[PDB]
């Protein structure tokens, strides 16, 4: 499917916000979303669709403990690019429960990036953000809420990104 997404799922946690210079953290603990942030850096952001669709509990083992137990979840894997080069790998797990009312948009993203700057129709909350890493790269997972309805976001920062 994609080597970056394979790395992403290998991320390992122990939270601990990386003592590394507080300029790497401001990225890793960033609360506004990646896209606009990547754009500020002066570059066209674009989405590469790897796989989107409903999956059962046994296809989301790393996320399951952080979400409620439902019949299926909407899984979306994408790669995010800056002026053509991959800067990040993204994997979203959305309990079917969350896809109620205006949240059915989470299913119609296409090659359009996820949340906020159009999600000025809803109102998000953020339970947390914990840093992870593996094979030398940074990654973070966060549980977001739209009207209280949870979804899990995990990202991996790739070598070409404005972190390392
Ligand atoms: C998981 O994080 C990301 C996901 C997506 C997406 O699915 O379109 C876009 C940007 C991200 O930072």
Q: DSSP of 95-112, one letter per residue?
A: EGGGSSGGGGGGG--SSS
- Structure-block tokens of residue 26: 């401001």
In the annotated binding site for substrate, the residues are: 34, 76, 114, 155
Resolution in Å, one decimal, please.
2.4
**152 CA distance to ligand 1 middle (Å):** 11
DSSP-H helix ranges across the chain: 3-10, 25-28, 34-40
**153 CA distance to ligand 1 middle (Å):** 8
DSSP-H helix ranges across 34-159: 34-40
76 lines ligand 1 (CB under 6 A): yes
Give kind and range of the element (H or E) at residue 137: strand 137-146
Closest alpha carbon to 153 in 72, 88, 67, 93: 93
CATH of the domain at 100: 3.40.1410.10
Task: Give the Cα separation of 154 and 157 in Å (integer).
Answer: 10
Domain count, the chain: 1
Beta bridge partners of 43: none
Measured CA angle at 121 (ends 144, 102), to 5 deg: 75
Determine the atom of ligand 1 nearest the C-alpha atom of 109: 8
Closest alpha carbon to 4 in 87, 106, 115: 87
**35 CA distance to ligand 1 middle (Å):** 8
CA distances from 8 to 75, 79, 148 (A): 14, 11, 26
94 lines ligand 1 (CB under 6 A): no
Provide CB contacts within 8 A for 20, sequence distance 6+. Answer: none
Domain that holds residue 14: 1-164
């Amino acid at each position: 499917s994609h080597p970056a997404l394979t790395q992403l799922r290998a991320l390992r946690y122990s939270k601990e916000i990386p003592a590394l210079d507080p300029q790497l953290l401001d990225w890793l603990l960033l609360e506004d979303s990646m896209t606009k942030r990547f754009e500020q850096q002066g570059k066209t952001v674009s989405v590469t669709m790897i796989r989107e669709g409903f999956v059962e509990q046994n296809e989301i083992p790393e996320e399951l403990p952080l979400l409620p137990k439902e019949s299926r979840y909407w899984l979306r894997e994408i790669l995010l690019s800056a002026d053509g080069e991959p800067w990040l790998a993204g994997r979203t797990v959305v309990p079917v429960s969350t896809l109620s009312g205006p949240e059915l948009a989470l299913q119609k993203l296409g090659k359009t990036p996820l949340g906020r700057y159009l999600f000025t129709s809803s109102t998000l909350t953020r339970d947390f953000i914990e840093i992870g890493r593996d094979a030398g790269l940074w990654g973070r997972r966060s549980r977001l809420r739209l009207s209280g309805k949870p979804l899990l976001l995990t990202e991996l920062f790739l070598p070409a990104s404005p972190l390392y």
